[PDB]
Amino acid sequence: MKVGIVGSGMVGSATAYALALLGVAREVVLVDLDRKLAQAHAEDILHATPFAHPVWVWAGSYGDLEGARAVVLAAGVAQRPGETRLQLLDRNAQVFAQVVPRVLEAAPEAVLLVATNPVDVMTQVAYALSGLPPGRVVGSGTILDTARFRALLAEYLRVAPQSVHAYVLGEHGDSEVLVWSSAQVGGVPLLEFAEARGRALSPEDRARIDEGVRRAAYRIIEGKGATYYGIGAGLARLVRAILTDEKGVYTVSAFTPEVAGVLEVSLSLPRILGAGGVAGTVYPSLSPEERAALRRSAEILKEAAFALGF
Amino acid sequence: MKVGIVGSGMVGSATAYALALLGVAREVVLVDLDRKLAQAHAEDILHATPFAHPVWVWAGSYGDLEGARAVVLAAGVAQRPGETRLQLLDRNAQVFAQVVPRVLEAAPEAVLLVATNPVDVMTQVAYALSGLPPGRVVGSGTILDTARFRALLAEYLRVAPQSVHAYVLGEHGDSEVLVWSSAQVGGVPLLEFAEARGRALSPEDRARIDEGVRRAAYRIIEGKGATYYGIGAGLARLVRAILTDEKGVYTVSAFTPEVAGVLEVSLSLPRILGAGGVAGTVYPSLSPEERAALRRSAEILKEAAFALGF
Amino acid sequence: MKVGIVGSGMVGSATAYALALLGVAREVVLVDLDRKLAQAHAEDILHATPFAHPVWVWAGSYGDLEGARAVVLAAGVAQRPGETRLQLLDRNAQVFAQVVPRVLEAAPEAVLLVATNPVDVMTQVAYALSGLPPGRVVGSGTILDTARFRALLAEYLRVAPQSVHAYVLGEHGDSEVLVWSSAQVGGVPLLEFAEARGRALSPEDRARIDEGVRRAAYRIIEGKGATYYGIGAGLARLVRAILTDEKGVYTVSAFTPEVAGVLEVSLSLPRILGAGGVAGTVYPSLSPEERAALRRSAEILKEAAFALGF
Amino acid sequence: MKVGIVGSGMVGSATAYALALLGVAREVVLVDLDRKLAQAHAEDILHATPFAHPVWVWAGSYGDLEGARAVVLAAGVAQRPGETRLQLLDRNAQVFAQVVPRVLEAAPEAVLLVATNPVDVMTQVAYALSGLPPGRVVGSGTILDTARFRALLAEYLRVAPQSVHAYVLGEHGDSEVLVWSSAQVGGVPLLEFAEARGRALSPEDRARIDEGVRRAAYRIIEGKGATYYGIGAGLARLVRAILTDEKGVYTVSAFTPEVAGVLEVSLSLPRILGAGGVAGTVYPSLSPEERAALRRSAEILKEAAFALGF
């Protein structure tokens, strides 16, 4: 199986690295405006492969995405000193109007996997531009945060993260929604499991966990200037779900008909991921306070969209 | 890490095979009354190891269980033509009174993992005989059936089995309880997920799934005379949980203070499994009809116990 | 990819179990003259898959073989205490005369992988009956003995087994030839390297190792009645080689035009194994004594074949 | 087991990422002069672990190294466009003069694994400063070039890379020596085997391959400014070797008493790597020309060391 990556920067190369080390696909093609950057990365990683799995990593052009089952969109421009967040965005939407036609013309059956920040806005742009069914354009969204959430709860509960079912929904960023109300652990409600364990879960415990999840990205960016190891591996996992037609449940961003009262917007909700992308959406139970944050989250996004032409 | 297996028959050797192929432990010691059977098995499997993982598989005696972190009890005698189920049992309880002291004298810190059928009665015998804390003696119980249950639901729902949380509780056998009432899929109740999918789940669907789970063991036994591949791999998974202090949730059999109104009995309930065995029990929600079957199940067992001296 | 297995006893079933546990193929079809046996093994194995890899194991007829990339031929008769080498051969030959045509009708394009003892002569009849090109029919042959030979030499020298290059060639059995003369370790002559590590191989060392290798199968059979755990994993490796078009080097059995003067006979030589079966032979340096041993080995196999009419 | 990493830039961080993704160790501690960088990389990586293996990645000080079985030394200075080979060396030497003492105070019993360029001279200073026995300080050296050499030869011959035995020796850099003369494939002389497959290595073939190997790092650096993806996985393999006491053969750098007449210098030779670090050397056959190339290589490294006072 072949997999493509457009934008061979930290995020794109880190995704290629994770795919290689995990032996997810047998072939990975990197594409970038800076051809020598993409070649340098391909060969750097190729140097790794004999110490992991046989994976053919190379750099090429769009035409070389031919036969790819999924193409990661990790392309984007560098933030200018004194530039708004609103113009950085516009520029990237411009990059994407260039990239999407060129991807789908070479690889008309590929699922599109959006990585470039802000993931939800960029996921919408990509959906509009593709003209494909809504399930074919998937954004990484809040997967990392959902896993962080579960990890912290598992830590607190002295249990395996695998038995913790909790979600982070909505906008990947500071307004994302941690779904405390309906999270389960070992098939039973969070709080009941917590107390049959000697660990109520004080409002102060919840604040610590919410910070742990909510501000991770920010702390990472503050310390090294950008995130990529995490998403690299998250994306690899999503590619795996696609290639193996896994139909596993993931909090990923996609174009939604409606959510919490808002129409036609891309945000994270637990979705069934497989061969053709996302075929089906789970709708977890929300507290009034939780769904109010979700719609407010949905509000912000869907207006950012229109106000960019998408 | 070292792991021991007492009873090097189909079940014990198949467990050793699964441990080897999966590279769960670095060393596996087999023990059997028939020394040459155990040696033959160890070396047969050792022939396999270069095609999987470096695992030192050998045959020895009880003293050779020294340093084992877990010891599988897969020992048992062959059914006699014209013998009751009640006397086959008695004989095995006799085998176990021999085996348990000898295991724990060589390996005083090992977790005991019971395999020999009937698992719940044999798990009780082993608990009584050990004199160890209740969490140190774990039976495979209904793990296979819990996984079968989840697999069939996942099949029906066109979803990944990993997102299906459902339990089979109680007595490993024809009176086991499939917990339909409170099963979840992707963190939401089974039936709500089923309908937001176009698949109500008719009483006829439930009957098909219940047969699929309930009678698998019987069909297998009917066709080749005994089950071992399944439990082999199930046991390997339990050994893994122990060795990695995973604290993962498994429907395994253990001595319980109380369950559905019955006191001091070994049966399957979802339990946290780790370094010292099982440290904690989940209590899933049950329908009135479900808990009535659980107690009736508990009834049968706990009397089989006393009536055997354990 | 689909793998077929014809002959679902201990050899065929362990193979399928090993395929499942290692996640070599997505689908494994079991075929046996005893239909309920195959079905029982299939369900027993399917019970294990949740504890390893998503693998679809099921039992069916010869037609259910359609599209299989490789077919393991493990069908044969129950041994009879007292019967000769040649008597058993006559019976299994009789079996392949039924099985082979049926496989090729259903999956003409499958690589045939022969496992049934004596594997060298059985490979010879599978090949003659198949009318396939010579590389598309391959017996497991001597692979387990080659691997044990490397392991014992690695133990003696205190190095990883992967560092050791040595072969056992010819008949899978008493006459097989350990190639001491040109054995390498980390790319250098074994004797030289052994002496450099300050440990020249005494005749007694050589003697103990030969025994360890050549008489392994004998001990397993005396102790438990048959071998299967070993070959199951070796066979799974061979299947993997074929599915992934590895072009790996394996001492497997195949029809060979001439060897040490003996003409048109099937035995193990190091061969390159990939998607079409074998496609290339490696000729290690044989001392004069080893060539004579090989010649003698080939002559034994050639006479056995001739008496059956092959 | 705990692995330490000192120097948490692109080389140190990819290493940790590769350790995490491959599940080599349970704990990886990151140490950097820039504390928020290390913390950021640690959290970025921790974000990936749910999509791979339970690995605890965190950032701390030198004391947090206590109990580490191996420590990766990847600390160094930012390159300066225009600076010489010797200038950069002087700066990194200065760095190890601070780092080394601090590591040995905290984890005296850790195998030191050197990564910082130029790795051969840096290994030399780590060794002299450490006062450790010679095998307990090991540089990554030439491993990536050895592996690329095998891959290109395997591609040319159309065989699996595992079948190919060949080494690159000496300086990790321009003077490194590809050992054509005694290269083996499947245990036989490469030239002979190449000709047997009907494909003798033309001078142009040899020429293209040398280039492919020797100038890989150069291209990666021109295209993206530094190498790290490759060495990260190579280093993770070396750590694995040490943690598991593999006694595997690797072309890694270490202090060597004499080589081709050059005395007391660190360079890559094939070495046996296990729990104490390296403990044995393998001496491949060098043609007269290769010996001269090696001699020349060793002399270059020895002069560089001497000018720093080592």
Ligand SMILES: Nc1ncnc2c1ncn2[C@@H]1O[C@H](COP(=O)(O)O)[C@@H](O)[C@H]1O
């Ligand atoms: N139109 C485009 N097509 C492909 N790659 C692009 C395009 N525009 C920018 N890039 C690359 O996207 C990458 C973003 O890097 P990073 O933000 O570090 O992941 C950079 O390597 C850019 O060269």
Ligand SMILES: Nc1ncnc2c1ncn2[C@@H]1O[C@H](COP(=O)(O)O)[C@@H](O)[C@H]1O
């Ligand atoms: N006291 C005992 N200690 C160890 N192994 C035993 C004992 N009694 C019976 N066994 C073995 O337990 C195995 C049960 O085989 P199976 O029922 O096929 O798993 C047989 O191989 C017996 O030899």
Ligand SMILES: Nc1ncnc2c1ncn2[C@@H]1O[C@H](COP(=O)(O)O)[C@@H](O)[C@H]1O
């Ligand atoms: N003509 C045949 N077609 C298919 N399977 C067969 C045939 N003859 C024997 N077998 C099976 O081959 C298997 C041999 O088992 P084992 O020798 O234990 O690997 C048994 O399960 C037999 O039923």
Ligand SMILES: Nc1ncnc2c1ncn2[C@@H]1O[C@H](COP(=O)(O)O)[C@@H](O)[C@H]1O
């Ligand atoms: N004395 C030191 N102790 C610890 N880390 C250091 C020291 N000097 C430099 N480093 C780090 O070494 C790393 C080199 O990064 P790179 O060359 O990209 O692998 C940088 O993160 C530096 O901060």
